[PDB]
Write a protein that binds this ligand. Structure first.
Ligand SMILES: [Mg+2]
Length: 379
């Protein structure tokens, strides 16, 4: 009898009869890799809407098992976490697929966004640390096979669409696994052309200066207004807390003050009191920023802009990292991200700023969290 299903926080694991721990793994995505629709539709019409993708598949799997590879599936199924796909039904579909494939598999299912969702390596770490009886797995001798491979359109007849995702290729990259597409692997087709995301989080450094120009000072001894600018999730608020509010700057958040009449009133009152003020908002465009410049000008104090360099990709990456690691994080919607980008006009001295400091996007974190930060986290 099979050890069967285990249900964890944001993970399902199935261990078939005959699964043995091994020092090397041949791992597979499920949908689009081992199976596709029987119906010939892009998306399955029922739980039973599947067939084995290529008849070459079972033979390769038998060869792999005979060579000592532990056969494993790593499948994203966020429809389960979203409530659109019942777990108990998906479990049944998997068991039927495994029956048809005719070999013992261990299956890991990422039901939610976060640490377990490919390309993040959570499922690999669960396999290694919890589900392989303490046997170290040689990543160099293993392989991951999947269809979310970032391929350009037309790698084969009837593939006018590029891959929906690069999550499978990126999962392999994060873990250090050799990677192949189903057609490369099962069919021995030549390598398909693919693209990787433009932002590579492995390139993120703690290095470099905190701000530029370095000859400048983050603080002023006299009243002033600092206007922060940068994507939400860029880490503006954390920076502003650490360096300005800790130094006694009055924190101004337009969102929470109600009107402008009140935001500018707050600013003006702080300035009369001999205080320095920081505007901690996205402030993407000239009109957003002009209200604070005018406030400063009226009070006769300098206005400076702190321009956070994070790109949209870096911001979204940071947002996903914080969602996975920080229980106080307010998740930023893609709606607000792309909205900001639409509105963004870079700050210039012409608007009326005394100076503009650039704040490079830099790695802030426990060593483990640093390893996690350098993982691609979206396909
Ligand atoms: Mg797939």
């Amino acid at each position: 009898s099979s050890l069967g299903w285990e249900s964890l926080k944001k993970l399902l694991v199935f261990t078939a009869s005959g699964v043995k721990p091994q020092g090397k793994v041949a791992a597979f995505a499920l949908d689009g890799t081992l199976i596709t629709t029987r119906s010939g539709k892009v998306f399955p019409t029922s739980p039973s809407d599947w067939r084995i993708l290529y008849p070459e598949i079972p033979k390769k799997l038998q060869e792999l098992a005979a060579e000592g590879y532990k056969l494993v599936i790593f499948t994203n199924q966020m429809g389960i976490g979203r409530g659109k796909l019942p777990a108990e039904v998906f479990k049944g579909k998997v068991e039927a697929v495994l029956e048809k494939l005719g070999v013992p598999f261990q299956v890991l299912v990422a039901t939610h966004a976060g640490l377990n969702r490919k390309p993040v390596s959570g499922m690999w770490d669960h396999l290694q640390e919890q589900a392989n009886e303490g046997i170290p797995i040689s990543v160099e001798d293993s392989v991951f096979v999947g269809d979310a491979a970032g391929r350009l359109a037309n790698w084969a007849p009837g593939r006018k669409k590029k891959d929906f995702s690069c999550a499978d290729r990126l999962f392999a990259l994060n873990v250090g696994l050799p990677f192949a597409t189903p057609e490369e692997f099962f069919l021995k087709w030549p390598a398909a052309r693919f693209e990787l995301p433009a932002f590579d989080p492995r390139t993120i450094s703690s290095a470099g200066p905190l701000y530029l120009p370095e000859s400048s000072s983050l603080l002023s001894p006299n009243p002033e207004v600092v206007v922060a600018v940068g994507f939400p999730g860029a880490g503006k608020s954390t920076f502003i807390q650490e360096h300005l509010v800790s130094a006694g700057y009055v924190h101004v958040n337009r969102d929470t003050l109600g009107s402008w009449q009140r935001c500018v009133s707050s600013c003006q009152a702080a300035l009369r009191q001999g205080k320095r003020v920081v505007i901690d908002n996205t402030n993407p465009d000239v009109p957003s920023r002009a209200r604070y410049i005018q406030c400063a000008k009226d009070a006769g104090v300098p206005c400076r802009c702190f321009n956070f360099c994070a790109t949209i990709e870096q911001a979204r990456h940071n947002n996903r990292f914080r969602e996975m690691t920080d229980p106080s994080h307010a998740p930023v919607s893609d709606m607000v991200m792309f909205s900001y980008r639409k509105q963004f006009e870079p700050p210039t001295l012409a608007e009326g700023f005394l100076e503009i400091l650039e704040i490079p996007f830099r790695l802030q974190l426990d060593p483990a969290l640093q390893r996690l930060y350098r993982q691609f986290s979206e396909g």
